[PDB]
Amino acid sequence: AARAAANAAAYPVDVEHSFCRRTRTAALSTARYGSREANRKLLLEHYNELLRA
């Protein structure tokens, strides 16, 4: 009945939503496509879709 706070798991991929309270900043990261710019395209679309809320 014990687990580490930092799961730091694997066998998956995502956009990794996260926030940093130290500097009051949100953090999203890239993982799906091989090139960096295709990921910039995907996260830019995710940012636009984020603002539909």
Partner: peptide, 24 residues
């Protein structure tokens, strides 16, 4: 087994009280 099967202690001996992290 130091209570290997049914304890809150012997299951840290059998590596189960630490739940195994999902990895591969």
């Amino acid at each position: 087994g130091k209570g290997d099967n049914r304890t809150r202690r012997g299951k840290i001996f059998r590596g189960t009280y630490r739940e195994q992290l999902p990895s591969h």
